[PDB]
Amino acid sequence: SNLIEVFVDGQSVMVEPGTTVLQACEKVGMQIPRFCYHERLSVAGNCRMCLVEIEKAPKVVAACAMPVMKGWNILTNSEKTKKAREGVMEFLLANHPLDCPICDQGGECDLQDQSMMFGSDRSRFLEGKRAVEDKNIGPLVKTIMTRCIQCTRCIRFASEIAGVDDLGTTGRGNDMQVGTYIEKMFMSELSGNIIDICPVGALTSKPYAFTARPWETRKTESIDVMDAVGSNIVVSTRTGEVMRILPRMHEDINEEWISDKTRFAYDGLKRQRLTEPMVRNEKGLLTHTTWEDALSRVAGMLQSCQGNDVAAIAGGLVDAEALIALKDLLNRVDSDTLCTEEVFPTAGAGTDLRSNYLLNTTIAGVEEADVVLLVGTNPRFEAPLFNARIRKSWLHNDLKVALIGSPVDLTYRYDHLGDSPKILQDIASGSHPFSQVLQEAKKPMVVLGSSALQRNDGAAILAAVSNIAQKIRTSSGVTGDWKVMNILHRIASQVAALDLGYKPGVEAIRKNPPKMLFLLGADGGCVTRQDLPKDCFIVYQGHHGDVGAPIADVILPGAAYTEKSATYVNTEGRAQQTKVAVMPPGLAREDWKIIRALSEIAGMTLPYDTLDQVRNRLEEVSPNLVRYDDVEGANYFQQASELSKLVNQQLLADPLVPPQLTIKDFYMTDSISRASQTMAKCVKAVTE
């Protein structure tokens, strides 16, 4: 039943026809060494390391890109196989300079490992050793092209995933410079990913460059933040502190890639942090004190204050644990005006009813989709690995990607349909040459960006897109069961806050002014002191405060995301937990621990002591927030769309636009990216 036998060292194994020899050897366990093969890119054959002596033939053939004929016998440990490997390894190490002390991949080279485990023990080639003058590619990536072995892997990665096409081979003979001809600062998204593509020490990190060496660090589990998708991130840590991060692999989401903001964020994570709990002072100033004074002042004011005069804006990067602790505390006082950072609208019951506030499909599940329309967003600048997934589908099989909302720099020929909600109600009617493609295609997907939802067109666009979803779902017979419709997000803590059933947005504060409020990471222009009564009493709990810290009344130095065993949810409902990597500097306790100490000092209690009891209460409140690395999509789209008909709003005539549109707004408007200097370097490098 469509299986071909290969005799790897006499051991027979079944292989799907058409696949490579190397995947058969990796099926039985063998690693034929490789330099120009990679398990995400196209298969070029330029490194010659993958060779193997296939029997009954006088010629050694490659195994990176060999199709499998019927009934092979593969010798991976013969005589001339080893002679070919020693020969090719002796060829590679000729025009490669002696930099292994100063090269930035001492522990993580590839020439070193494969030269030990397959290469010769003596060298030759007394003269020669050419040298290529380096370039200046960008302030993010340090570049010495002398160590470049011309392996053509950055080129294939750029041209087939980045889509930028700014890298090339130049020349002949030994003189093949891999690079960029026009002295252009190569700046794009995913350019941070190219320093792990390059298998030798030729493309290294610029700010990291000479700060560690990868045997001293220890590696630690962690979860991506400031992106809605959550690649799996491994912190190489050192000195009771950090060194760097790397992307590690989840199969479904964010395969072997990461965002540049995540990869270069940690400079701002350790630059302007908060180590002192801080109280205002009689001149009007902000000084610091011990925890007893600060928590006693907050507890006395909290025992004095009840009613509908207590608010809690929790945005930025907050936990499931801190939000559970705050919901229990704020139930325990009397009542609430919890709020989140980004205003999500609730008119067709969007807080409950699991569909309309997560990504209903799978991020990996978009490959089987066929026609995707894309209402206002910018996937290159909003969770870029989602855009890399869409480009992966666009490059492997056929798609049809149309965009409604902005003319932007997407890399793969979106079909621009205009930018107004009149276009959206016009496709709701169906007067296009593209509605036919929708309702008579096979597998449809509609991706709604959350950034086009902060405006006053929120519930109307959401209900109309859900009517599109009901139209194409109840028509055309697809599949069942499979989902046209999904939304995405920008911040994972907002997704966890919507999962816990909170009030989204500061509309509850605009309807009801409070007298006491807890700012758990108030990033942007949510509230001011002019828009609030003069006895403010903000308790801002966070880390490297630059907004809210000028608006300070009581500062509590919360921990960061690398610094606590949190519980985060991506934009598709999968609950991923962070792990302890670096203890926070200063006093800097964990957030829910601070909240439970606050409830201790105030005249009340909380019925838990440990983080395992916190996660027990988490499974009590919402059941899928402890079943780690798991997905289950929602249902009941008929009930959702029939509940979307009560509040009959209007659709404005103004054109919409996402503010996440270019490089400067990709780099500025987040806390950890704002606190750094590497972001400022690349901002002034792109603008200048």
Binding site: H38, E108, E160, T220, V234, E241, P247, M249
Partner: protein, 126 residues
């Protein structure tokens, strides 16, 4: 000599001698160590490493060092299967978290389809 023997659980935490705080407070993590992405080699896979959560490592103010009061912080136990991993972690007493194993999914790559005709798959450089 084939005596009375009962077939039950074990309670070896009384005999291993380490005190109660380091028994019941720290939580083990059983994980397969992920591939160090700057290299590409899965020989460092195929084991189940048990580690513990990290704790405080301050600065010794006389030399600029990283001292800690953590004897259990620098362990790793290499195991062959998840089953004996969980059996050992429940034998010796301390609470634990177990993750699962993630593999490279087998793709179907082909140079001839990388040089296609009417598909959008085209290398555009080679």
């Amino acid at each position: 000599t084939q005596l009375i023997t009962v077939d039950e659980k074990l309670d070896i935490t009384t005999l291993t001698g380490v005190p109660e705080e380091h028994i019941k407070t720290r939580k083990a993590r059983i994980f397969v160590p992920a591939r160090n992405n700057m290299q590409s080699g899965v020989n460092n896979t195929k084991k189940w490493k048990m580690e513990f959560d990290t704790r405080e490592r301050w600065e010794n103010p006389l030399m600029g060092w990283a001292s800690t009061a953590d004897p259990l912080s620098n362990l790793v136990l290499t195991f062959s299967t998840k089953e004996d991993a969980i059996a050992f972690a429940e034998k010796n007493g301390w609470s634990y978290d177990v993750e699962e194993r993630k593999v490279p999914k087998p793709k179907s790559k082909s140079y001839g389809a990388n040089f296609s005709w009417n598909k959008r798959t085209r290398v555009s450089t080679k």
